[PDB]
Amino acid sequence: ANLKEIRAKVASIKSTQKITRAMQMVAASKMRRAQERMAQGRPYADNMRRVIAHLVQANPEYKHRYMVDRPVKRVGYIIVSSDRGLAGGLNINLFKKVVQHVKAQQEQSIEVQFALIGQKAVSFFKNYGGKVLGATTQIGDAPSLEQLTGSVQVMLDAFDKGELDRIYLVSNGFVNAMTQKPKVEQLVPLAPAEEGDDLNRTYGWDYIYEPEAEELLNGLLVRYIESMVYQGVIENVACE
Amino acid sequence: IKKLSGGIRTALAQYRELAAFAQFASDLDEATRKQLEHGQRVTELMKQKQYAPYSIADQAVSVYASNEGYMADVEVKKIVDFDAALIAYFRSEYAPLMKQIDETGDYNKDIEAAIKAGIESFKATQTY
Amino acid sequence: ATMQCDVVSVKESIYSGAVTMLIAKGAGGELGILPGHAPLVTLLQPGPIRVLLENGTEEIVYVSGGVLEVQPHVVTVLADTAIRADNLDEAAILEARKNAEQLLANQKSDLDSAAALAALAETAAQLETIRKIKNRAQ
Amino acid sequence: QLDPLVVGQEHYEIARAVQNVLQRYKELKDIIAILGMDELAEEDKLVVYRARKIQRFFSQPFHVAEVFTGAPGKLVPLKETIRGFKGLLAGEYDHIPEQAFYMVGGIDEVIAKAEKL
Amino acid sequence: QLDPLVVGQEHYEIARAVQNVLQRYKELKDIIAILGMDELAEEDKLVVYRARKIQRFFSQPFHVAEVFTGAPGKLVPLKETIRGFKGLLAGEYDHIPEQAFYMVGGIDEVIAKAEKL
């Protein structure tokens, strides 16, 4: 029978369930706190989009590479995930979808290059092998601008040499407080999206630039894509 | 005793409800943190030695001091020493009030004002 | 007249107020701001930004590089890293935030491990020796 | 009779492997139940699927049970049983759904039922 | 018999503090096995050395036994043990190597060992 140990085991299970629900409250509090950073990433992108829209409208003579498309033979991927486990089926379903995507790409006789963020992702990607271009770990609650330069830097310096053509991103879609849908969108082959603005309200004047506009423009694109990576990372943290 | 027991009752209840939150103490909200601190302080206040038959005067003084947050600043480790020193100082200095309380057990505005004034005095004159 | 001075960074916008005088240090060097100026964009050297309000009160913010944008109706300066430049250096201030982040990460990892890995395994350790003996009569 | 001197080496190894897999799945059941299934190791997922298919494959329609179910009975020689279990433990049928292993005869009937599905 | 009135207040304080330090040593092993000492820097390591010497200090050679010692007396009074534990808790012997605490009776003996090595 061992009845005494039955009451002891019941008490232990009750205590562990209580601490489990307490950890649930802590996770909810962290989720809310992270959700509070959902709004501040957009104004930077808005201003950057406005200024480059004016820049291309005023000087529509040089078609730069970062918003043009050429025949595709190589692509790049970016993965952001968790540093530990017990985060639900988020990372594993995300990786199932991305492996389906790359398998679909494989039939076109094109391979992939990628560098990721997360211990689980490096572990599971090394458990099956592939081509990696960097690694990161131990980011925690607060990612920084400096902590997330390596991945975007390697993507940029790989694309600028013509090795790569298009770069996607892989994250989780925080549809609302308790939903999730994975997403995949391009970053580097910047396609014209919502570019009809600033046309009807065009300005007959133009800004003056002490240097040539090229360095300013490509610095602006760099600003845009670091905002992309920052927004994706914080959105994934909030969803996770 | 009847009019002062409710504070310790609710304090112990709220401390027992959230006893599992005493392992983080890092990012919990302000109300929960204050409740945890007060629960720890009151549960350390109930510490009692042996062969120390407290009367009702010192019990009332200690309970009233704990109720109004007049012992919050005291470190949890030295709560027993602070309580004992406060009781001893009150016994040495404020004897007539103790005799009146022990004899009748009545409550009044005057008694509460005198007890609070004595606690405010002890906050500075005597060091534990 | 004054002019709303919007400062924005990738992480956060720390100041946005109406100011009158803005002295900036671009690629050429130091250059001030007056109303009605021709709009322009200019790379800013890794130094601080100095402004004086209408009453003369000064606001000092650090920028470690960025492109300027000033025009008579709107003023906005974008910075990769920016914070109030009470000194010529900010490492001694940012190290406190670094310590806070590292400590929070370490404590969170410890809490997660202790709460989950030990407790759930301990609960799941022994359950079948009782289920297998439910119908026993001894 | 279950010793290698009486029934041969292959039979003994097949039986021992089957029993080991079943025991491992029975061990994993509790942590699968109270917690999720994602946190398991990949080998544990393979063990779970193989064990479920194994306990599916041990069912058989009888001749004297035709009144209860209405299906004709089947008789299986032990050579086909050993073949099927060795193939199952090897991993050749890791893509077959576990519904195709229910109330059949040999592994050929399993293949036919899976294809018809 | 650990009443502070009869055993002595210092005895009570030292015993309780030593037991709590040993408990702190006991809890650290699981966290070390999970994460390591990356978290534990400037904290919980001092407890590690202190409880290491505390555990080694309980060792004592035995008079009747002759296989591992030459019948040493080692019948030190209580006062020696309490004084040594108080000194070790305070931290004067914190810098002393932990491996000099094995098979030692008194503080003078471990001091002689430490100056010997």
SS3 assignment for A40-100: CCHHHHHHHHHHHHHHHHHCCCCCCHHHCCCCCCCEEEEEECCCCCCCCCHHHHHHHHHHH
Cα gap E86→E57, rounded to integer Å? 13
Q: Name the nearest CA neighbour of E18 among E76, E58, E60.
A: E58
Cα gap E111→E89, rounded to integer Å? 16
How far A70 CA lies from chain C's nearest CA (Å)? Answer: 30
- Does A88 contact D38 at a Cβ distance shorter than 8 Å? yes
List chain A residues with CB under 8 Å of B27.
26, 29-30, 33
Contact yes or no, D with B (3+ CB pairs under 8 Å): no
Between helix D9-34 and helix D78-90 the angle, nearest 10°, is 50
Size of interface C-E (CB pairs under 8 A): 14
Residue that the structure tokens 């008579």 belong to: C72
Alpha-carbon distance values, A70 to A189, A232, B111 (Å) = 9, 26, 90
Cα gap D33→B29, rounded to integer Å? 34
- Does A22 contact B27 at a Cβ distance shorter than 8 Å? no
Cα gap C124→C126, rounded to integer Å? 6
Strand partners for C18: C4
Strands (E), C1-138: 3-9, 15-19, 21-25, 30-33, 43-44, 47-52, 58-63, 66-67, 75-79, 82-83
Count Cβ atoms below 10 Å from residue C28 Cβ, excluding itself. 11
DSSP C114: I
Task: Give the best residue of C102, C103, C110, C112 to mutate against chain E (max E CB count within 10 A).
Answer: C110
List chain A residues with CB under 8 Å of C45.
none
- Yes or no: say if A182 and A173 are a contact pair by the CB < 8 Å rule: yes
Size of interface A-B (CB pairs under 8 A): 13
Count Cβ atoms below 10 Å from residue D107 Cβ, excluding itself. 21
- Does C123 contact D34 at a Cβ distance shorter than 8 Å? yes
Strand order in the sheet with C30-33: C30-33, C21-25, C47-52, C58-63, C82-83
Residue E92 touches partner C, C-beta closer than 8 Å: no
- Yes or no: say if E100 and E32 are a contact pair by the CB < 8 Å rule: no
Cα gap E28→C36, rounded to integer Å? 68
At D92, the amino acid letter reads E
Distance of CA B113 to the CA centre of its chain: 16
- Does C114 contact E31 at a Cβ distance shorter than 8 Å? yes
Cα gap A91→A171, rounded to integer Å? 9
Q: What subunits make at least 3 CB pairs under 8 angstroms with B?
A: A, C
Q: Give phi and psi for A189, each to the nearest 5.
A: -70, 70
Residue E38 touches partner C, C-beta closer than 8 Å: yes
Domain boundary assignment for chain A: 1-59+208-240, 60-207
Parent domain of C29: 3-84
Q: By a Cβ cutoff of 8 Å, what residues of chain C touch chain A?
A: 8-13, 26-28, 38-43, 67, 69, 71, 76, 78, 80-81, 101-102, 104-105, 108-109, 111-112, 115-116, 119-120, 122-123, 126-127, 129-130, 133, 136, 138
- Yes or no: say if A175 and A84 are a contact pair by the CB < 8 Å rule: no
Long-range CB pairs of A12-21, under 8 A, 24+ apart, other chains included: A12/C122, A12/C123, A13/C123, A15/B20, A16/C119, A16/C120, A16/C122, A16/C123, A18/B20, A19/B20, A19/C115, A19/C119, A20/C115, A20/C119
Contacts of D11 (CB under 8 A, 6+ apart): D82
- Yes or no: say if B28 and B18 are a contact pair by the CB < 8 Å rule: no
- Does C10 contact A227 at a Cβ distance shorter than 8 Å? yes
- Yes or no: say if A164 and A75 are a contact pair by the CB < 8 Å rule: yes
- Yes or no: say if A139 and A117 are a contact pair by the CB < 8 Å rule: yes
Alpha-carbon distance values, A13 to A85, B17, B21, C121 (Å) = 22, 17, 17, 11
List chain E residues with CB under 8 Å of C117.
34
Cα gap E111→C33, rounded to integer Å? 76
Contact yes or no, E with D (3+ CB pairs under 8 Å): no
DSSP string, D32-84: HHHS-STTS-HHHHHHHHHHHHHHHHT----STTHHHH-PPP----HHHHHHH
Q: Which two tokens stand for residue A237?
A: 């943290």
- Does A22 contact B20 at a Cβ distance shorter than 8 Å? yes
- Yes or no: say if C21 and C33 are a contact pair by the CB < 8 Å rule: yes
Angle, vertex CA A225, rays to CA A223 and CA A230, nearest 5 = 95
Domain boundary assignment for chain D: 9-116
Task: Give the best residue of E31, E39, E42, E43 to mutate against chain C (max C CB count within 10 A).
Answer: E39
Helix (H, G, I), strand (E, B) or coil at C58: strand
Q: Name the nearest CA neighbour of B110 among B123, B96, B124.
A: B96
- Resolution attained, angstroms: 3.0
Q: Name the nearest CA neighbour of B63 among B84, B82, B45.
A: B45
Residue that the structure tokens 């076109």 belong to: A108
Cα gap E79→D91, rounded to integer Å? 72
Contact yes or no, B with C (3+ CB pairs under 8 Å): yes
Helix (H, G, I), strand (E, B) or coil at D4: helix
Q: Name the nearest CA neighbour of A77 among A113, A123, A108, A128.
A: A113
Radius of gyration of chain E (CA): 16
Contacts of E80 (CB under 8 A, 6+ apart): E106, E107
Q: What subunits make at least 3 CB pairs under 8 angstroms with A?
A: B, C, D
Residue A205 touches partner C, C-beta closer than 8 Å: yes
CATH number attached to the domain at D9-116: 1.10.1140.10
Cα gap B77→B117, rounded to integer Å? 26
Residue that the structure tokens 């760099």 belong to: A222
Cα torsion angle, E23, E25, E29, E32, sign: positive
Residue C118 touches partner B, C-beta closer than 8 Å: no
Cα gap B12→B18, rounded to integer Å? 10
Cα gap E48→E36, rounded to integer Å? 13
Residue D31 touches partner C, C-beta closer than 8 Å: yes
Task: Give the best residue of A13, A17, A86 to mutate against chain D (max D CB count within 10 A).
Answer: A86
Q: Which two tokens stand for residue A135?
A: 């690694």
Task: Give the best residue of A15, A49, A51 to mutate against chain C (max C CB count within 10 A).
Answer: A51
Q: Which two tokens stand for residue A9?
A: 């085991």
SS3 of E15-50: HHHHHHHHHHHHHHHHHHHHCCCCCCCCCCHHHHHH
SS3 of chain B: CCCCHHHHHHHHHHHHHCHHHCCCCCCCCHHHHHHHHHHHHHHHHCCCCCCCCCCHHHHHHHHHHHHCCCCCCCCHHHHHHHHHHHHHHHHHHCHHHHHHHHHHCCCCHHHHHHHHHHHHHHHHHCCC
Q: Give phi and psi for E110, each to the nearest 5.
A: -70, -30
Q: Give me the residue from A20, A145, A209 closest to C40, CB to CB.
A: A209
Cα gap A41→A232, rounded to integer Å? 10
Helix (H, G, I), strand (E, B) or coil at E69: coil
How far C16 CA lies from chain A's nearest CA (Å)? Answer: 13
- Does C110 contact E31 at a Cβ distance shorter than 8 Å? yes
Strand partners for C3: C19
Contact yes or no, A with D (3+ CB pairs under 8 Å): yes
- Yes or no: say if D89 and D17 are a contact pair by the CB < 8 Å rule: yes
DSSP string, chain A: --HHHHHHHHHHHHHHHHHHHHHHHHHHHHHHHHHTTSSTTHHHHHHHHHHHHHHHHH-TT---GGG-----S-EEEEEE--SSS-STTHHHHHHHHHHHHHHHHHTTT--EEEEEE-HHHHHHHHTT---B--------S---TTTT-HHHHHHHHHHTTTS--EEEEEEEE--STT--EEEEEESSS----STTTTTTT--S---B-SS-HHHHHHHHHHHHHHHHHHHHHHHHHHH-
Q: Which two tokens stand for residue C88?
A: 């010529």
Distance of CA B107 to the CA centre of its chain: 18
Contacts of D28 (CB under 8 A, 6+ apart): D40, D44, D47, D48
Residue that the structure tokens 């200095």 belong to: B93
Residue E78 touches partner C, C-beta closer than 8 Å: no
Cα gap A16→C75, rounded to integer Å? 56
